[PDB]
Design a protein around this ligand. Sequence first.
Ligand SMILES: NC(=O)C1=CN([C@@H]2O[C@H](COP(=O)(O)OP(=O)(O)OC[C@H]3O[C@@H](n4cnc5c(N)ncnc54)[C@H](OP(=O)(O)O)[C@@H]3O)[C@@H](O)[C@H]2O)C=CC1
Ligand SMILES: NC(=O)C1=CN([C@@H]2O[C@H](COP(=O)(O)OP(=O)(O)OC[C@H]3O[C@@H](n4cnc5c(N)ncnc54)[C@H](OP(=O)(O)O)[C@@H]3O)[C@@H](O)[C@H]2O)C=CC1
Ligand SMILES: O=P(O)(O)Cc1ccc2ccccc2n1
Ligand SMILES: O=P(O)(O)Cc1ccc2ccccc2n1
Lengths: 400, 398
Amino acid sequence: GKQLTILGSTGSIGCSTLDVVRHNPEHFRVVALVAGKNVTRMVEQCLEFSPRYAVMDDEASAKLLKTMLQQQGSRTEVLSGQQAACDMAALEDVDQVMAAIVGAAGLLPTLAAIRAGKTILLANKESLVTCGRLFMDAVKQSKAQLLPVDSEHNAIFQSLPQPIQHNLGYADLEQNGVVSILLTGSGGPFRETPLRDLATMTPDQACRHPNWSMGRKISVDSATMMNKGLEYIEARWLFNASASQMEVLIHPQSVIHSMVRYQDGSVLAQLGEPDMRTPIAHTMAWPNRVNSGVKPLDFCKLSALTFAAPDYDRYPCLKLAMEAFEQGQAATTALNAANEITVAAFLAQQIRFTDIAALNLSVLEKMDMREPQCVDDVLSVDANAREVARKEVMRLASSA
Amino acid sequence: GKQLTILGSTGSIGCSTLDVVRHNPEHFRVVALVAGKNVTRMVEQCLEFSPRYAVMDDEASAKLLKTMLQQQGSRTEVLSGQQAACDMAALEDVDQVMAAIVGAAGLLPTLAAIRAGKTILLANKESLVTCGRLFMDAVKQSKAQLLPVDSEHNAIFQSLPQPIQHNLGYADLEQNGVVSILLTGSGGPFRETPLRDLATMTPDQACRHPNWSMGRKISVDSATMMNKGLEYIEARWLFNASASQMEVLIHPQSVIHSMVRYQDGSVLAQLGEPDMRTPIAHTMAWPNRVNSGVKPLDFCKLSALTFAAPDYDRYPCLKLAMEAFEQGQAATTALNAANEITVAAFLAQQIRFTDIAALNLSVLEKMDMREPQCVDDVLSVDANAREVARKEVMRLAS
Ligand SMILES: NC(=O)C1=CN([C@@H]2O[C@H](COP(=O)(O)OP(=O)(O)OC[C@H]3O[C@@H](n4cnc5c(N)ncnc54)[C@H](OP(=O)(O)O)[C@@H]3O)[C@@H](O)[C@H]2O)C=CC1
Ligand SMILES: NC(=O)C1=CN([C@@H]2O[C@H](COP(=O)(O)OP(=O)(O)OC[C@H]3O[C@@H](n4cnc5c(N)ncnc54)[C@H](OP(=O)(O)O)[C@@H]3O)[C@@H](O)[C@H]2O)C=CC1
Ligand SMILES: O=P(O)(O)Cc1ccc2ccccc2n1
Ligand SMILES: O=P(O)(O)Cc1ccc2ccccc2n1
């Protein structure tokens, strides 16, 4: 039995991982569940999986959870707050930690798992978007195993050779026959929109993916290719890839999830249904395999597969992400933070669709921060970048 | 580096192998070259790669090679005949043997390499199409490592987990998370031809593949999907795959080379340019990589990738091969041999395009031979199958 901690058990990734546990009771035992405020979901999960521990970040949520579990005869011990959440990530008997908390709040619990030398099933975006140097340095020091859960990074990982898989972050691509990492993205709803029409796209239009049904913020990041820009940042950290070892391709059908190019001409790819239980089950069972509940991909029921090079005039956020990487973790943290603000402003109809890239750039230009040296420095860059972005939004929404 | 014997050095695969060595002179030493009758090409290869031995199967050819190397000042030792070729495959100091002799002549030298526990870069079709049971048994015994060179099988191998790659031929697919092997094929030039028109296709039409330029025999095998049927037979042996663990898919663009389906939903695939140096260089360098001279696949200059299920009314030879596998090595050997006869007859304008599958079936129906127990037994089945086929052709053309 692999013993697990699930950080962010009540969200989308957490629920999908619990479905894999559900399919494989003989392979995985839930030791600890951690969430924020979803008491109702958390009760159900505690009843089904009988974790030794459950933690809620919010103290009033933990209190309610403590009492309901007692009445429903649950023996799970209820804890509260961030220290408790990091402790679950570092439990002696825990083998793997599903790192699936959203936002900067995912940082310290994910780091706790890394410092404890655990296998980390990495979902939280902020980990490598904002703390990529700090976290890869930390995994190298503890020899923690990272296994990326994100569909694209997981596809890359599966398409990579065994010496890289087992030394992830540290191994040399070149020495292992790898010439580049091919990161694929859908191109969003506006792949073919006349460029001059982008300024007038509405929130509803940007969120109407042709081939996806997801939350508004991630849907906008798909439309700007900010989503791929952030995954570019993560992949360079995760896979130890230089700028010339990265290729971003638009692949509108999203059937190929990403690819790896080798020295002999070979390209290895992972394909599948768009269901997160595939990459989650891959990371949970690695180096073996487990049923995930995902139906086999039917090749006779596909759109024709196509590819194209991103136009940075169409996707300036993609180019900003790549440029941000070269400026360091202060810049990537600032871009991620500014983008949360400007995307929310766009969705609230305070700015135009094209003002996301323009204001993201303006924030980066106005920032003057030193390379972060610890998580606390990153949190400070993030706070400051948000304030700079909010003030840019207000300037635009008010004045000139 | 690695010491190589190249069986069939003067042919297409042999020449591509030597091009990989040309790109990687520090990683590969050519110890022995073995060929048939192509003395001119053989001299040039001995002068470039400085092997210790050169073998011509044909004795007149060996005598002529010796005279030319002498004139040219080379001290490469010249040998002749079948035992010599097997001896090269078995040399104590060699690491890898490129098995690229064409036809049943490739069998004994390939077996010699297997019995010697060598790493076998396997590119002879008869080895597994005709001798799959005998050769996989021999591989388990000697612990020889097979590395398939054929593009589809190599793509599958690249897409399989490490415990299968090591242990190739005896590993359990299901235990290693593999649901099935997805063997991809172009569908040939008549993929969209009305079925009514197949009976009147000419040899020049059958050989005119929209995306290929190969020899006539294999171009016809692509048109009938016999080529994929034979690869289906090899894949079942190579990958220890039952019928239910095999899927054949038409992929017209031939960009994906083949795939492997996994328990969690994942499908891994290998893609690349249509250039045999890629899989050759993969097998030579494994488990590492080398430069092959092949240019990087440009994803911005591709046709859209499509897939389709093969229709056995359009491709009866594919179904015959799948069925032949279940009947055993006598049936697979008979089919391969009959198909050589019928394709040649088609190309000679003695029979129609659709007679190839019809007479292939007819031969198998006529034959009941028992499972071969040794290479002599398969040679015997092969010889009898050809005679049945030639008579079927003569009857038809009569
Ligand atoms: N969704 C996807 O397909 C993918 C997402 N990702 C990344 O994975 C992460 C998780 O995504 P997803 O599951 O969709 O996000 P959700 O918003 O669905 O879930 C977030 C989880 O984090 C919990 N949480 C929030 N704040 C805290 C905190 N302070 N302490 C402890 N738990 C907290 C939430 O608890 P509660 O709800 O109870 O308040 C919830 O369980 C994100 O960073 C995302 O970018 C990566 C790859 C794919
Ligand atoms: N071509 C391809 O893309 C692929 C082919 N295959 C298979 O690989 C094998 C080789 O194919 P290919 O390279 O195309 O074939 P060729 O016909 O081009 O080459 C055959 C080689 O075998 C030699 N040969 C023939 N008879 C003997 C013999 N009795 N003893 C020693 N050598 C002999 C030839 O010598 P010589 O010319 O001097 O007389 C030549 O060097 C075949 O079984 C084929 O089906 C598999 C994967 C890919
Ligand atoms: O690749 P993107 O645009 O960043 C996000 C995205 C969009 C559509 C998708 C459709 C199926 C699967 C994954 C997808 N991912
Ligand atoms: O797949 P098939 O039809 O058996 C043989 C075939 C035909 C065309 C091809 C084009 C590019 C690469 C491989 C090919 N192979």
